[PDB]
Amino acid sequence: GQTVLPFTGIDFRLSPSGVAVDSAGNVYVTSEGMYGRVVKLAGTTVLPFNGLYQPQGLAVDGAGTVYVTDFNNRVVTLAAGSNNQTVLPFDGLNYPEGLAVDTQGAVYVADRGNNRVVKLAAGSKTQTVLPFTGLNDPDGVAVDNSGNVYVTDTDNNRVVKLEAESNNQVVLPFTDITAPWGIAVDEAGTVYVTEHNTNQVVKLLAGSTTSTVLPFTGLNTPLAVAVDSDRTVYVADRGNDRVVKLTSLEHHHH
Template sequence: MPLKNLNANPHHPASIKNSFFLLAIVALFIAACGNELEFNKVPASSAVSVSTLAGSGAQGSINSTGAYATFYQPTGVAVDAAGNVYVADFRNNLIRKISPTAAVTTFAGSTEGFANGTGTYALFNQPTGVAVDVAGNIYVADNINQLIRKISPAGVVTTLAGSGARGNANGPAAGASFNYPQGVAVDATGNVYVADYGNNLIRKISNTGMVTTLAGKDSAGANNGADTSATFNQPTGVAVDAAGNVYVADEGNNLIREISPAGVVSTFAGSGARGADNATGTKASFNGPTGVAVDASGNVYVADYGNNIVREITPAGVVTTLGVTGTTASKLFKGPYGIALDVAGNVYVADYGYNMILKISK
């Protein structure tokens, strides 16, 4: 599987070098401040604050409240209508749930492996992305198992799509194949979209259980165009708006792409060069974006992983750094990987390096 330089590469089950000194400092600082660590900074465009919703900063799988809970390199996050936050806890092979009162529990999973079942009787292998539908069902990109899993509100885990073999086969869900799927999103009618990282494709699982290629072909590139004439390079995050436009964090290309309901792929923002320039459309730059989310007004939010910042893109394509500017911004995050929104417009970030779930309140 393709690797990028890191400290931490959630695309590959390689060993990771972690800064235990930094984590210790973070944990001590949180303990000194209480359960909620607030970072109030000068806003770039609107008044926001960044706080720790859950996680001490130490690696672990402790279920507790707020900063007393622990995660191990979380990569995906989703929020339901009731304000519950679901986390793809990558290294722990778990799906965690954070209640509106910040109580952290294990929603599904236990050790590494594959098994369908209820709650902790189910098994995952390095889950990377999560999404939640209007009925409260959770969808999981089960990365190493090459599967898309579904969890009912009661915690019953099933396989939605994938045979378990690596590949790019379309067709009925059970016979389809993926290649290290990274991100998932679901629309209002129950269609599921998958950032198929290893295949450089965006896949669609219809609400009738058919898997198709929405856009891209099985080769890396940055071509815009219709359907399979377009190309991606390691797409990692995916989101869908109410109109059916699909947004893609095209990590290898340092771009945010848009797929129209007609299947036409365009570059929504980014020049393709690595950078952190705030500008409009293709004059802006990103550095390995991994997560993307969209609000009801059409604003797109990006986990700009390589820059350690969160970006906001207006419907007109104007890119800003959310809430903070300059070097201060990069100190708030250490590998922001997954991103999600609640109904009030608050932003949630799965911070891979800090082992935390952070909340950006507007």
């Protein structure tokens, strides 16, 4: 049932490390590589970020601002239709991977080299380190509408939720999760994760005790995942230089 998104007119291998989807259903991908790019499928274009070096993760907020991590160890943002990027004041990032943006503009980064997740509130000049414990190469972060934060503890083969109320770390009941990397949370609290070296994508329903394997086929190193308002799931299928899409919408009287 999946489809491959038709990125056309492109002079470089797509190398998709990250994937985000805005309200209009524009799809954005970080194209890894020495000369990093963010590519936007509507036709296809390239956003005027300058000097991206191996960009690893992206997110798009409700205003259409695109936020990107890269291996210059920073987060760059581009406001919709701007051609002037700004570098957010994160400190000490070491191989930032996935990032997330919550409804108040706060930016969260899986800081893989420091085995932590860092937070920067909107307009603040200093970051916070979130109270996770025992992380080993976190690659992916997601934040729900309830301020719960979710991380892929990659080398621990687990996903941890820092609950907004208790500030407790819960190892979410994924079933046999391996080397989880990409993650997203949809508006129903459902958590999607890529198991990146085992080439599956799994989901966990909010408040549920176990998980399921989404019916993707032919994945090769899925490193990110997004989900739109139709609860369509998009995957950065990194080894295949493509993004694949899987719709969840029900079929009338079938």
